[PDB]
Amino acid sequence: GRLIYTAGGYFRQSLSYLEAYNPSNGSWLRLADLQVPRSGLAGCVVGGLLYAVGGRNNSPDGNTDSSALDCYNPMTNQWSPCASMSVPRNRIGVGVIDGHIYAVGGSHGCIHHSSVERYEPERDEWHLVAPMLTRRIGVGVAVLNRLLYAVGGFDGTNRLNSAECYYPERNEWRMITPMNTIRSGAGVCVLHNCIYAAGGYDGQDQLNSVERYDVETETWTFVAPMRHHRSALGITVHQGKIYVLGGYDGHTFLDSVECYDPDSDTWSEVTRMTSGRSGVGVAVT
Ligand SMILES: CCOc1ccc(S(=O)(=O)Nc2cc(CC(C)=O)c(NS(=O)(=O)c3ccc(OCC)cc3)c3ccccc23)cc1
């Protein structure tokens, strides 16, 4: 019984929620709030612990990007601080390879990072690795075949359809085939050996479209679109289906969670979050 955990997010201000969804019975758990509110974070899991990485606290008193790494233990229902990153990273992307967390891109005020750093939980230390070829905020990250892909985003001037691949053993990045569509703030994940990029913002509108990358054919193909157009959506994969959570549709902050079934190539409404929000961090344990 693994749960879908959603941390933080934004509606009127950054949020402190930690909620978990159990797909096998439809139930939502209300778990311990984050110590500091944050939106534009990413979530991931190492060792059955949930990590909240980066983001920003957009509050009525003002706006502060986060270099924070916090760790939630589902056994104790408690958040514990970890070593902070080298730099704050709002609108960050994250991936895990061999039990190490990669923090990719993101912003600190006006600085759009190309830099990438790696956390080792066993030593509680971050270290920089080779930077990306492109500065990317609002970037999606997927891990596939022990390689890390950085997909789309915004480089400070252009919104991106480009994507790139990081080779940990070699410590190098290479550009891959660009997507069909410019996307920042998309949900990017891996399912059944393909990278999926769902939604985002193309410079003009929120998107419902979804495309997937086949690493051997080197081509992106559109699949069924989502039921809602969404940017700043959370994403994860649970039992062979993609789950997308919240986001901003151009007018409203959505509470909709939808599910992609790769067998039928369809999306379905599965549940609603307790309140609409965007810019959450999501992970499954
Ligand atoms: C009226 C819409 O207001 C908001 C306010 C805050 C958020 S948020 O979720 O807390 N912040 C973020 C904000 C944004 C930009 C905003 C303010 O929408 C991100 N990037 S983005 O969605 O690529 C995006 C969306 C729309 C844009 O044009 C005008 C509204 C530009 C870029 C994000 C990408 C990933 C994660 C978080 C993002 C999202 C929307």
Side-chain angles (χ1 to χ4, degrees):
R2 297 212 296 160
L3 299 188
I4 297 170
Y5 289 82
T6 177
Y10 177 95
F11 174 78
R12 300 194 196 301
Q13 55 188 52
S14 299
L15 305 173
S16 304
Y17 306 119
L18 176 68
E19 288 175 305
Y21 178 66
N22 186 338
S24 88
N25 72 20
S27 86
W28 280 96
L29 304 188
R30 177 77 192 267
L31 301 179
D33 291 349
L34 286 162
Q35 267 302 287
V36 176
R38 50 221 286 204
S39 48
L41 72 165
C44 63
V45 161
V46 171
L49 302 174
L50 167 73
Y51 293 79
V53 193
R56 173 175 184 97
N57 179 8
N58 288 127
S59 66
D61 306 323
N63 297 354
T64 302
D65 293 327
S66 177
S67 63
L69 178 67
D70 303 286
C71 178
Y72 171 83
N73 188 346
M75 291 287 245
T76 62
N77 196 40
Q78 175 172 243
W79 289 97
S80 289
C82 293
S84 302
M85 298 177 289
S86 70
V87 69
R89 296 174 178 282
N90 183 41
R91 308 184 192 172
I92 189 174
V94 154
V96 173
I97 294 174
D98 284 349
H100 304 136
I101 304 175
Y102 286 82
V104 178
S107 63
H108 171 206
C110 303
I111 301 155
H112 300 72
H113 306 304
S114 63
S115 61
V116 179
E117 55 186 297
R118 174 185 47 231
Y119 180 71
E120 288 178 52
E122 335 72 68
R123 305 271 250 31
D124 190 37
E125 292 176 353
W126 291 93
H127 300 285
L128 285 163
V129 98
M132 292 186 292
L133 305 176
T134 313
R135 303 175 302 269
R136 306 185 182 264
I137 83 164
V139 58
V141 166
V143 176
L144 174 60
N145 291 129
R146 307 169 52 80
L147 308 177
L148 177 96
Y149 294 81
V151 175
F154 183 69
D155 71 13
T157 302
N158 307 286
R159 208 165 299 279
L160 299 178
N161 60 352
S162 72
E164 45 193 298
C165 181
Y166 175 68
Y167 292 83
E169 288 301 281
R170 291 172 176 89
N171 197 211
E172 271 146 22
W173 291 83
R174 251 187 70 246
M175 297 299 315
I176 66 159
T177 307
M179 288 186 288
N180 297 306
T181 301
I182 294 170
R183 309 172 190 274
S184 69
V188 165
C189 72
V190 168
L191 171 70
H192 292 172
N193 217 53
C194 282
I195 297 168
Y196 286 79
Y201 179 72
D202 68 359
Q204 301 281 118
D205 302 280
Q206 278 73 23
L207 300 167
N208 65 350
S209 65
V210 184
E211 57 188 300
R212 85 171 159 218
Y213 184 66
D214 177 322
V215 296
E216 288 302 345
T217 76
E218 301 184 54
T219 123
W220 288 93
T221 306
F222 290 100
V223 298
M226 304 181 287
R227 304 202 88 86
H228 300 256
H229 295 249
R230 315 174 181 250
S231 58
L233 63 145
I235 195 161
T236 192
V237 172
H238 182 276
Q239 308 286 245
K241 299 179 252 51
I242 301 178
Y243 290 73
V244 155
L245 289 80
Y248 189 59
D249 70 359
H251 311 94
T252 60
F253 285 92
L254 303 171
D255 57 15
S256 167
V257 178
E258 56 188 295
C259 197
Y260 180 72
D261 175 347
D263 291 348
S264 53
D265 179 52
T266 60
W267 287 89
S268 295
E269 296 277 2
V270 284
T271 187
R272 292 183 186 102
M273 292 189 291
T274 61
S275 51
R277 66 192 75 161
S278 67
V280 300
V282 186
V284 169
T285 199

